[PDB]
Amino acid sequence: METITYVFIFACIIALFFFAIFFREPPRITK
Amino acid sequence: WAGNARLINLSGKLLGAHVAHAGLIVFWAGAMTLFELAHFIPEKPMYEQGLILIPHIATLGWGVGPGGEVVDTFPFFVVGVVHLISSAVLGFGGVYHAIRGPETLEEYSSFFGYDWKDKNKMTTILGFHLIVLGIGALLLVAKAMFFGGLYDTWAPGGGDVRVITNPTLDPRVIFGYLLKSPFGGEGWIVSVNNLEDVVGGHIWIGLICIAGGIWHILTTPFGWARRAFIWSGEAYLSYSLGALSMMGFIATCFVWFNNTVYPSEFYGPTGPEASQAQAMTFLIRDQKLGANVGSAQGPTGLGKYLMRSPTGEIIFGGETMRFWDFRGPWLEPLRGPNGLDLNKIKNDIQPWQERRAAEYMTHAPLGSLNSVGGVATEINSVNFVSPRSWLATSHFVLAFFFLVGHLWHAGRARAAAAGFE
Amino acid sequence: YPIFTVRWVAVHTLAVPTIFFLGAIAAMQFIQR
Amino acid sequence: METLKITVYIVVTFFVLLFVFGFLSGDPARNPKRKDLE
Amino acid sequence: AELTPEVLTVPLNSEGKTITLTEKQYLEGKRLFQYACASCHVGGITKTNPSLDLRTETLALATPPRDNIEGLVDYMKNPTTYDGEQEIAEVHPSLRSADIFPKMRNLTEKDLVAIAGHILVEPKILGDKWGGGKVYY
Amino acid sequence: WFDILDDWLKRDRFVFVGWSGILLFPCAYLALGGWLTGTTFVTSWYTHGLASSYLEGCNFLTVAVSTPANSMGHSLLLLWGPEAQGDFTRWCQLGGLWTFIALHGAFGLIGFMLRQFEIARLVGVRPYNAIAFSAPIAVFVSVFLIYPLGQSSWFFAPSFGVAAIFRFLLFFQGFHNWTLNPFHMMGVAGVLGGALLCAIHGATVENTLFQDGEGASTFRAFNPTQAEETYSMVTANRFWSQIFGIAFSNKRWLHFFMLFVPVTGLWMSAIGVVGLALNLRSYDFISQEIRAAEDPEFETFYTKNLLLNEGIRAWMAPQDQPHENFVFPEEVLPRGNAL
Amino acid sequence: PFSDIITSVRYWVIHSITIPALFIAGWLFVSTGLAYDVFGTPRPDSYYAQEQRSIPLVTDRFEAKQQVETFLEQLK
Amino acid sequence: NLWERFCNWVTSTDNRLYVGWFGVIMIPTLLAATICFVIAFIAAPPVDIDGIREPVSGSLLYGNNIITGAVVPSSNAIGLHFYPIWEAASLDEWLYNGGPYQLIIFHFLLGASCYMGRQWELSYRLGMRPWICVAYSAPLASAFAVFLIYPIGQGSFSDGMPLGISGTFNFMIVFQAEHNILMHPFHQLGVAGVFGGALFCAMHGSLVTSSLIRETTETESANYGYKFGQEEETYNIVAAHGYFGRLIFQYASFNNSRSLHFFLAAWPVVGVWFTALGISTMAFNLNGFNFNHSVIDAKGNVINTWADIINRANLGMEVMHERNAHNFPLDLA
Ligand code: CLA
Ligand code: CLA
Ligand code: CLA
Ligand code: CLA
Ligand code: CLA
Ligand code: CLA
Ligand SMILES: C=Cc1c(C)c2cc3nc(c4c5[nH]c(cc6nc(cc1[nH]2)C(C)=C6CC)c(C)c5C(=O)[C@@H]4C(=O)OC)[C@@H](CCC(=O)OC/C=C(\C)CCC[C@H](C)CCC[C@H](C)CCCC(C)C)[C@@H]3C
Ligand SMILES: CC1=C(/C=C/C(C)=C/C=C/C(C)=C/C=C/C=C(C)/C=C/C=C(C)/C=C/C2=C(C)CCCC2(C)C)C(C)(C)CCC1
Ligand SMILES: CC1=C(/C=C/C(C)=C/C=C/C(C)=C/C=C/C=C(C)/C=C/C=C(C)/C=C/C2=C(C)CCCC2(C)C)C(C)(C)CCC1
Ligand code: OEC
Ligand SMILES: [Fe+3]
């Protein structure tokens, strides 16, 4: 269990990747 | 102050420069050879002073007896002088060609020496310089077979200068070295054991150089070659630039792990030599204290002196187990089928072998900037730094930066073709 | 132009001691034992 | 496992021919944004 | 606190006569030690045979005795196992083995004496250290 | 008579001497001379046992200004200090320099952040720089004051030298296993992150510079009206986005974030040290130690390291700490086989 | 500084005689031996009192001065 | 015909990344490393680093916490040889002799190398200069130095550099106890490069932040950005160049933006350039300085220089590094 917790917080840091890189807010020049 | 970049297109000045720096390279050849035969003392391990070229000169077995420093002093003075004067012969040339006047408008000249972007002329100039290496290479061959030999460290007794006969000219053997794993002891070019391979390995180059020099002379590059490569002046540097880098590495690693080419007798002992040398030194020591080497059991259960290699042979134990690939003239006679013969060991071990072990083991390539010899912790009363560590060290450095150069100049050829100029 | 705190002092405050030391140090290098 | 060693080499060289033949490529060659010389 | 005569007033032979060295010599001792020794005898400790040192006390227990100069000189010319039963000239530097230890070829009687002196004066200066490397170990 | 001085003093010359100019220069000068003086002329073996200066022949690296003797605690022994009794020469023999340098030098740091505030209200700029500067000042007090305070005395504070600092490092590794502290880890994060930024930012710019801005094609020009500046955010963006995957493109954030990383880090690190001041460390993993003793066939890098430490401590503490007078018999010393 | 006195001759003139006057003034600071006595940085003659294998330490907070002297009288 | 349609894909924008000829190797490579590596850290069995039969296990399942460690170096027996999977027998074996190490390393370097190439190639498809290729070259080169050159210079990947947090520390410690780095200019410039970058990345961003366009839609309740379309850019460089110049002196400050940002990419990169060399130079035994003795010829009494107490610590550690794996008196590698 000391384990799953180091894993759990791991899967999130990769889940955050995907979601940050593929679901980010657009950088547009519409301005 | 990109001064040297303003010269790019006025080939009339580059000749002035290329032949100016070409004058330094030779200058150093004399300034150092003479500086060495200067400080140089006879009968003291070449390498325990701090020399580099002489060792090269004795490599070619120019002046030596069975692993005996030098019987004839002179051979080095010749080299020291020649190159020191070739430095003026060219200093004159470089300077002149640099200052007296540019090129490309001499009609009969442009017929003998052309310019860039002209694949057929660049090609032609290239082949030329290829006909020159084809020769220098083959000259080395001459100096081993019909001339004052070359230094063979192998069989037998002392391996003084020996002349070679019928070099390994087999078509297979030569490129086999190219097709072999560059790992664990086996580095393609480094694996070179027999000195005869080395001679024959040079004969084929020259034939290949020459057969090539002429080839481009007569032929301009095909389509595929034209659409892959660019043709700017800067870009040809990027090609040549990165080529040299690889080699810096090449030779460096080539330096650390000796092939007869770098007889450890001048250069010193190999990083592994020292370790393996330390194992052997102690078998004897205890053997003299009546210790039985086969039944030894080190705190690990691996036997202090003898253990195996994954493929199952015998090798000196201890961290020096990682250098069982090591081979030299002293450790070999104990070698036999299945690894080291426990029977030649305790029975047939000559004394002159303990000497070499002790000497090498004693002059471990290990050193610091203060030239302090041995472990990082020793006292400053011993000066030494194996030439190899010097060559390996400095030369690594250049092979690196130089690569940084392959990136910088080749990435700038992408800015000429259309990018930023 | 004149002599002034800034230009003047700054420079000699730092720059003068230095040569006194460089002088002292230069003397050291030859000492024995 | 000898079956494995083989499989690998195929894979590896496979993607090598894609690097090599991707550059010598008569088709894409050295096409940039500012100038195409063909 | 300077280098003194007493300091250099070292034993010359087994019986009881002594010689007092000089400044000039002492220094040549080091220079020579470092030249054909240090490498194997750094700081006065055998690298090839750690269980045997060059400390003064251990030299007296040799065969023949070696706490004095004449003994060392003899050793440098011809070697003697700690007990004196084997001829280790084919293994250890010796004026008799110049042909194999080229560093020895040049050496002279005066130099042996000085080298010997260096080895006997050191311990009075360094103390425990020169032994098994205290500061050094 | 006041405002005048304000101006004369705050007069815009070559070297700006403001109101703070009075603290800064007298202190930042003496703190420099103090170093350079002893560095070149004083010995600290009456107080530390080693060689301090060039006078005895140390190399630049070796030479330093050593800390007072542990027998003195935290007594600021100033020249008129009951202990030195006004005798300069001895005031130096005893190390009365360290205190000198740290104190004057502490105020020079005070002056330098003050001078950073002045200049911002004369020019009318933001105070931010003055704030970024707190990190170092933290690190400084943390190190040279807080730490020595918590411990036995002034002696244990870093020594003013090169090597004398490396020895500090190592000291920490052995008795504190500072590397395991998480705080030093974050500190280690920002410093390496500061350099990572410094490269990508500086390289991106330089390399995304506007094409043809110079016919000659070298890049040594600008002007005030060059409002747009020499490079593209739009291209960088896509560059990164497609190579690294992320790229917040809003110049104002990029630079501020460049304040956060380095500075945010050193504050931690400094915190981490206020901790060690009280021998309160992150030198152990109960969980492991426990299973480390009930079982001998189990080992991790955590362990292998704790072994090196004891080696550092046993061998290095008797020469490194002269006052307790440690006598350690050969046998006693921890020691791996054959070495 | 765009080179201001850096070019004139007066700058060289007033220093050509000034700087080599400190360069020397300093050198004599070491050859004469004021350093040692002004700073109290023992010389190779005075580290260990021949056959005094101990390192002078300091123990009492108030006797630093009388302690140090106790060490200088010894060496003499 | 098809062959042409494939290349076009690889070559331009794909709404996620750019995967050119360089990422044709980089993508499958770095994947094998990631996967292998993640799993090795969560379950790898113990591995005996130095040939000795004393396995070390730095994996999650086998009793570790994150800092405690990870993927351990190949055996010292296979040390310098090529250790693939096919080349061995059962994976129970492989797992013991450090296989994961080599496998992960080599793929990573190669793909690490290509990640660099990829950086340049994107430049060629976007007409911009080729510099970023160069600044990455610093750490990359360094990784290689630590993960390759050394084990290549030393004689075995074992003691390359563990893939754990903890072992990183070990590698460091053992390292300076064996080669004494602290006192080596290349690691000194290294600290210069890094402490450099820190001081500069704070300086720049600090100033750039202080000299902003004080009057652009920024009030005390909101703070919203700029976008390329914004001409004058964010700050008044005259205010910054004026600020810094007044803090020390005119020269001290930077006139234009090129010298500013060029400096930012020059200091760090050329600092690590050297350090990465530092290691590579001590990979073949050209260890740092070592001023072990300064004397008082008076009697020859040895005087300890601050550096000796450095050798006193370097000492304790030498003695106990790789406890019980030494059979002979002096380590020679
Ligand atoms: C094959 C050889 C080679 C050649 C012919 C060139 C040629 C050129 N280079 Mg390239 N370069 C090379 C290798 C080469 N380079 C390598 C290996 C690298 C990677 C480090 C570079 C990196 C490089 C850069 C980064 C730049 C160039 C530039 C240029 C142009 C420069 C003109 C100039 O201003 O020089 C001026 C040169 C100098 C002031 C030399 C500085 C050398 C160092 C500091 C000396 C170190 C010595 C040290 C003191 C010794 C200590 C003693 C020792 C015993 C310990 C010129 C076309 C410039 C350009 O714009 O290209 C078009 C440019 O910006 N080059
Ligand atoms: C590798 C070495 C090297 C070389 C070969 C060159 C070569 C050259 N440089 Mg470059 N340069 C270099 C390094 C080098 N540079 C570096 C490191 C920098 C940065 C500091 C520069 C910066 C630079 C600038 C800024 C400029 C050049 C220019 C030039 C060209 C000048 C031609 C001339 O007639 O000058 C005039 C010649 C002289 C003043 C004479 C020098 C005489 C020598 C020392 C004599 C030596 C004695 C001789 C061997 C005696 C022979 C006797 C006989 C009996 C044997 C030339 C091709 C210039 C240019 O525009 O080129 C296109 C230019 O403006 N360079
Ligand atoms: C890298 C290797 C290298 C290379 C490739 C070259 C290549 C070359 N060299 Mg160089 N050289 C080198 C190294 C090298 N050199 C070195 C190391 C040195 C120093 C030893 C020299 C010294 C050198 C000299 C001294 C000369 C050359 C010349 C030449 C060119 C000769 C071509 C020819 O057909 O000449 C055949 C010669 C001729 C057709 C001569 C015609 C004579 C002229 C037109 C007379 C003008 C006088 C007229 C009466 C004036 C009327 C004026 C009115 C007011 C009265 C050629 C480009 C020659 C050159 O550049 O001159 C053309 C030359 O004179 N080289
Ligand atoms: C001096 C060096 C040299 C250089 C720079 C060149 C350069 C070139 N050659 Mg030439 N060549 C050389 C020597 C050289 N050659 C020699 C010595 C020979 C005789 C065998 C030839 C025979 C030759 C032929 C027959 C052809 C060329 C062609 C070409 C062009 C090919 C385009 C290309 O690179 O495609 C891409 C390149 C590759 C796929 C090859 C990569 C090879 C690696 C880097 C080197 C491997 C070297 C080897 C293993 C080392 C020897 C080890 C030793 C121990 C035995 C190019 C301009 C072509 C041409 O110009 O067409 C008209 C062509 O058809 N060359
Ligand atoms: C003097 C001869 C010599 C030379 C030149 C080399 C050279 C090299 N050695 Mg070897 N070595 C030698 C002797 C030698 N060694 C000996 C005697 C031993 C006995 C112990 C070793 C043991 C040894 C080990 C243990 C290792 C090396 C490694 C390396 C490489 C390091 C650079 C790199 O990262 O390349 C990266 C690759 C390139 C720059 C590719 C160049 C080839 C063409 C131009 C590109 C192909 C592109 C494509 C993307 C890649 C396909 C590669 C394929 C393997 C899948 C370098 C090629 C390291 C390595 O990475 O192994 C190969 C390594 O770990 N060597
Ligand atoms: C508080 C005071 C202090 C000071 C003054 C120093 C100073 C130094 N340390 Mg130490 N250090 C300290 C505390 C201190 N340290 C502490 C508390 C620790 C933790 C125990 C360390 C740990 C430490 C380590 C581990 C190392 C150092 C090293 C160094 C040297 C680094 C050189 C460097 O590049 O720095 C970074 C700074 C810069 C690159 C820039 C400084 C600014 C310069 C002077 C400006 C030059 C500009 C010029 C005047 C104007 C040009 C104008 C332009 C427009 C053209 C330096 C001598 C390193 C070394 O090499 O040791 C010898 C090293 O490895 N230090
Ligand atoms: C190697 C470490 C390091 C050094 C040497 C260093 C140095 C410096 N940083 C400055 C500034 C800054 N540094 C900053 C952030 C950072 N600086 C960092 C790391 C360093 N910064 C880091 C990691 C950061 C990120 C937080 C900022 C944000 C600024 C500034 O604004 C300022 C500047 O203007 O930039 C250039 C300059 C301040 C001058 C001053 O205030 O004098 C006053 C005080 C003096 C002279 C002495 C006080 C007394 C101290 C105790 C004595 C030091 C004496 C030494 C021991 C003796 C010499 C030793 C030799 C080995 C060198 C100074 C050159
Ligand atoms: C920097 C520069 C440059 C360059 C330069 C160069 C490249 C140079 C070179 C030079 C050279 C390349 C030189 C050479 C020289 C030489 C000499 C000067 C020699 C001499 C000699 C002698 C004198 C002799 C010896 C001897 C002998 C043989 C015998 C025994 C004895 C004796 C020892 C006497 C240029 C111009 C481009 C431009 C500008 C810059
Ligand atoms: C103590 C005191 C005092 C005084 C003093 C002072 C303040 C001083 C200062 C001093 C100083 C201030 C000094 C200095 C010295 C210096 C020196 C001796 C230097 C040198 C340098 C060099 C040699 C350099 C070089 C270089 C090079 C070559 C290159 C790279 C870089 C460099 C720059 C590093 C008083 C009375 C107030 C009171 C209290 C106490
Ligand atoms: Mn990993 O290590 Ca290069 O030092 Mn000696 O040999 Mn093995 O012991 Mn440590
Ligand atoms: Fe910026």
Side-chain angles (χ1 to χ4, degrees), chain H:
Chain H
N1 182 59
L2 182 84
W3 201 96
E4 345 153 316
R5 203 205 210 193
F6 193 37
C7 302
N8 292 277
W9 186 64
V10 185
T11 301
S12 183
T13 171
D14 253 59
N15 182 30
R16 28 231 187 218
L17 316 155
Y18 171 146
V19 191
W21 300 128
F22 275 151
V24 169
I25 298 167
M26 180 208 40
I27 296 283
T29 283
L30 306 193
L31 279 186
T34 294
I35 311 293
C36 184
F37 166 72
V38 163
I39 290 160
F41 187 125
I42 297 175
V47 176
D48 72 327
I49 317 192
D50 314 278
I52 312 164
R53 305 301 176 193
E54 174 153 60
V56 179
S57 58
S59 25
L60 282 173
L61 282 179
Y62 294 11
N64 273 156
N65 63 18
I66 325 182
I67 317 161
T68 297
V71 174
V72 184
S74 287
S75 157
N76 193 282
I78 296 174
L80 200 60
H81 272 149
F82 184 58
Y83 201 48
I85 308 188
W86 49 73
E87 184 75 356
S90 74
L91 306 197
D92 279 315
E93 150 165 15
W94 187 63
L95 294 178
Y96 191 99
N97 298 269
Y101 198 64
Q102 295 192 14
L103 173 68
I104 297 175
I105 284 196
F106 298 125
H107 284 84
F108 166 73
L109 302 181
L110 299 186
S113 170
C114 299
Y115 176 89
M116 180 178 75
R118 179 193 176 181
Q119 300 204 331
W120 160 80
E121 189 193 326
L122 181 69
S123 289
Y124 192 43
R125 317 298 182 204
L126 297 187
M128 75 173 76
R129 310 178 72 191
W131 274 50
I132 306 182
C133 182
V134 184
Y136 184 55
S137 307
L140 182 78
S142 175
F144 284 59
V146 182
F147 281 61
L148 198 74
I149 303 159
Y150 194 80
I152 305 187
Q154 291 288 149
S156 55
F157 290 119
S158 63
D159 300 49
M161 208 244 303
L163 322 190
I165 297 188
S166 229
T168 298
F169 298 49
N170 181 283
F171 173 71
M172 302 237 273
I173 304 168
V174 163
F175 206 74
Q176 178 267 169
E178 296 245 38
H179 306 293
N180 196 312
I181 320 172
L182 304 178
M183 304 278 277
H184 195 303
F186 291 160
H187 171 290
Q188 298 193 182
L189 292 156
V191 173
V194 176
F195 272 58
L199 167 39
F200 298 108
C201 216
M203 207 68 293
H204 190 87
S206 178
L207 291 180
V208 169
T209 303
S210 279
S211 286
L212 299 187
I213 280 195
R214 321 160 183 202
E215 337 165 309
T216 297
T217 310
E218 160 203 5
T219 307
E220 306 175 342
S221 154
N223 285 77
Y224 263 82
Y226 310 56
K227 279 203 186 172
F228 204 73
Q230 282 196 9
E231 30 182 52
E232 177 63 334
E233 278 301 333
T234 315
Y235 61 93
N236 205 315
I237 325 188
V238 174
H241 174 48
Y243 182 68
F244 201 65
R246 307 285 175 158
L247 201 62
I248 312 150
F249 54 78
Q250 65 184 59
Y251 185 54
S253 188
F254 273 70
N255 38 30
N256 55 40
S257 201
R258 159 263 181 71
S259 301
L260 278 178
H261 293 106
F262 184 98
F263 211 60
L264 308 181
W267 207 227
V269 186
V270 172
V272 188
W273 269 165
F274 276 166
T275 319
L277 285 193
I279 307 174
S280 183
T281 282
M282 310 166 68
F284 318 66
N285 290 157
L286 179 68
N287 337 310
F289 281 145
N290 69 125
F291 304 66
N292 300 287
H293 278 40
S294 279
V295 73
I296 303 157
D297 280 36
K299 187 169 172 177
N301 294 288
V302 182
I303 303 161
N304 308 118
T305 52
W306 254 128
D308 284 316
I309 288 185
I310 285 194
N311 200 302
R312 202 73 209 214
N314 301 193
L315 211 41
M317 313 147 69
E318 188 199 314
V319 182
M320 298 183 59
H321 87 262
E322 278 169 69
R323 70 198 177 194
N324 68 201
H326 301 151
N327 291 305
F328 301 136
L330 271 188
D331 135 278
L332 291 179

Side-chain angles (χ1 to χ4, degrees), chain E residues 4 13 22-23 26-28 40 47 51 53 55 60 63 66-67 69 75 85 98 104 109-110 119:
Chain E
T4 338
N13 90 10
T22 69
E23 213 170 356
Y26 176 60
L27 312 177
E28 281 169 48
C40 219
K47 278 192 175 177
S51 41
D53 64 70
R55 157 108 42 86
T63 304
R66 290 198 169 61
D67 56 308
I69 296 150
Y75 198 30
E85 302 286 65
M104 302 290 315
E109 292 298 316
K110 175 191 167 171
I119 304 189

Side-chain angles (χ1 to χ4, degrees), chain F residues 73-312:
Chain F
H74 307 206
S75 323
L76 313 162
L77 282 193
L78 342 176
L79 195 60
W80 55 105
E83 186 166 359
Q85 278 172 45
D87 183 325
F88 191 106
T89 303
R90 290 178 185 173
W91 173 58
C92 297
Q93 290 170 41
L94 316 197
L97 285 191
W98 202 75
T99 318
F100 185 95
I101 309 175
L103 299 175
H104 282 94
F107 291 76
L109 295 179
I110 289 191
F112 196 92
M113 179 153 56
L114 283 182
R115 190 190 153 166
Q116 212 156 359
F117 273 144
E118 237 178 38
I119 307 195
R121 196 59 194 166
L122 274 184
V123 178
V125 182
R126 275 196 157 187
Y128 278 25
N129 224 305
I131 284 170
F133 200 46
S134 56
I137 308 177
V139 178
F140 187 76
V141 179
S142 191
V143 184
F144 314 83
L145 309 170
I146 287 177
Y147 192 58
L149 307 190
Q151 306 204 95
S152 186
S153 58
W154 286 128
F155 181 144
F156 299 82
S159 299
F160 287 135
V162 183
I165 294 306
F166 295 110
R167 161 278 184 197
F168 195 80
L169 314 175
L170 306 174
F171 184 98
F172 268 47
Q173 176 50 195
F175 308 54
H176 303 300
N177 201 356
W178 171 241
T179 341
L180 284 186
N181 203 310
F183 294 0
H184 176 264
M185 307 195 296
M186 321 182 66
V188 181
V191 197
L192 298 163
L196 179 105
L197 289 182
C198 233
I200 296 172
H201 190 65
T204 275
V205 171
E206 214 44 43
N207 196 110
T208 293
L209 293 190
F210 277 117
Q211 330 160 321
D212 309 311
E214 185 106 330
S217 294
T218 281
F219 319 78
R220 203 81 188 171
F222 96 96
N223 72 346
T225 290
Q226 201 174 313
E228 197 71 306
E229 205 42 37
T230 326
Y231 81 98
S232 190
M233 287 283 281
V234 194
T235 284
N237 189 356
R238 190 158 200 199
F239 199 75
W240 291 149
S241 218
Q242 285 176 166
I243 298 182
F244 195 68
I246 181 162
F248 198 14
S249 1
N250 277 173
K251 283 285 192 134
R252 66 170 189 161
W253 170 238
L254 225 68
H255 294 75
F256 180 15
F257 190 73
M258 296 189 237
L259 188 78
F260 193 65
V261 175
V263 190
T264 288
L266 312 203
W267 261 82
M268 303 285 86
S269 182
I271 287 184
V273 177
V274 176
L276 308 184
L278 312 177
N279 289 292
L280 204 92
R281 331 150 164 165
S282 282
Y283 183 68
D284 59 330
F285 275 30
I286 299 169
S287 63
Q288 302 258 322
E289 291 305 64
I290 296 178
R291 168 167 170 175
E294 302 185 324
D295 193 4
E297 312 188 312
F298 164 88
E299 170 193 34
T300 65
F301 284 79
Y302 165 80
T303 297
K304 306 195 74 154
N305 295 313
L306 303 177
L307 287 181
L308 307 157
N309 308 292
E310 189 58 22
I312 286 181

Side-chain angles (χ1 to χ4, degrees), chain G residues 33-51:
Chain G
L34 296 189
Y36 299 90
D37 302 313
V38 160
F39 281 147
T41 299
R43 332 189 171 191
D45 263 18
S46 308
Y47 279 75
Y48 295 78
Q50 198 178 353
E51 286 163 31

Side-chain angles (χ1 to χ4, degrees), chain B residues 39-386:
Chain B
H39 283 229
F40 191 41
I41 302 174
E43 287 313 347
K44 183 185 183 172
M46 288 200 67
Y47 62 64
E48 189 161 302
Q49 306 171 52
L51 314 197
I52 304 181
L53 304 167
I54 304 170
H56 272 60
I57 306 171
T59 289
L60 303 188
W62 200 219
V64 162
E69 179 202 43
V70 200
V71 171
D72 205 299
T73 308
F74 209 49
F76 311 136
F77 200 42
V78 168
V79 202
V81 187
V82 175
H83 288 78
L84 188 62
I85 300 162
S86 305
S87 63
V89 196
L90 314 193
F92 207 165
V95 184
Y96 159 59
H97 275 288
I99 315 163
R100 209 196 168 177
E103 190 220 339
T104 244
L105 292 168
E106 293 218 316
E107 280 214 46
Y108 174 98
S109 318
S110 303
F111 186 83
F112 197 77
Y114 222 74
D115 279 0
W116 295 344
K117 288 210 199 174
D118 198 316
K119 335 177 190 181
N120 66 33
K121 291 293 166 183
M122 294 296 90
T123 310
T124 312
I125 300 178
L126 167 44
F128 276 155
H129 285 155
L130 275 176
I131 306 174
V132 177
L133 306 186
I135 309 164
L138 303 165
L139 304 210
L140 167 66
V141 199
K143 190 150 191 179
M145 39 175 50
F146 199 64
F147 278 63
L150 205 58
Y151 192 114
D152 189 297
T153 297
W154 304 91
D160 46 346
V161 170
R162 84 154 178 157
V163 264
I164 313 174
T165 291
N166 86 149
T168 292
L169 205 53
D170 177 307
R172 309 161 179 181
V173 66
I174 312 289
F175 299 64
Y177 285 130
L178 283 181
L179 315 185
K180 296 313 168 178
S181 174
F183 293 123
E186 299 149 51
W188 63 68
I189 308 167
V190 182
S191 312
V192 297
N193 184 307
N194 173 23
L195 190 75
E196 316 186 320
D197 291 70
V198 170
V199 162
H202 272 83
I203 304 182
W204 281 76
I205 300 310
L207 295 189
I208 292 179
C209 319
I210 302 161
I214 67 179
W215 164 275
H216 319 76
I217 290 184
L218 304 175
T219 306
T220 285
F222 284 131
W224 57 279
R226 307 175 184 188
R227 315 153 197 166
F229 310 20
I230 319 190
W231 311 93
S232 190
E234 183 171 44
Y236 298 11
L237 192 46
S238 301
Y239 307 119
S240 301
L241 210 48
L244 298 184
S245 175
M246 189 170 99
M247 313 174 74
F249 280 59
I250 302 219
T252 300
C253 300
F254 198 140
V255 139
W256 205 254
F257 319 35
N258 286 212
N259 335 178
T260 330
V261 181
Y262 280 356
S264 61
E265 326 192 321
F266 305 178
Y267 292 168
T270 316
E273 279 247 282
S275 276
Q276 287 278 300
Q278 154 154 159
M280 195 169 84
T281 298
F282 290 74
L283 271 172
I284 323 176
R285 172 175 133 175
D286 320 23
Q287 181 69 108
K288 288 186 172 172
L289 287 186
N292 194 285
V293 172
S295 52
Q297 211 193 332
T300 306
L302 283 174
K304 302 163 201 162
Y305 329 73
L306 297 173
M307 47 174 86
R308 69 60 184 152
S309 71
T311 50
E313 302 81 308
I314 303 177
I315 298 148
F316 289 158
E319 274 188 306
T320 180
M321 62 195 292
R322 58 202 219 196
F323 306 98
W324 66 261
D325 306 65
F326 174 81
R327 283 188 63 183
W330 48 275
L331 180 46
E332 290 308 290
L334 307 187
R335 294 282 177 166
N338 284 321
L340 314 188
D341 184 286
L342 182 79
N343 288 295
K344 293 171 182 171
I345 279 192
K346 63 188 167 180
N347 278 309
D348 312 311
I349 181 155
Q350 284 315 319
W352 70 286
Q353 286 169 297
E354 294 173 35
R355 300 182 217 156
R356 310 288 177 184
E359 203 66 8
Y360 297 179
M361 156 182 97
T362 296
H363 320 309
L366 297 169
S368 42
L369 293 176
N370 303 157
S371 285
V372 190
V375 193
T377 300
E378 274 291 9
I379 189 170
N380 316 65
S381 77
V382 195
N383 292 319
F384 179 86
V385 153
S386 181

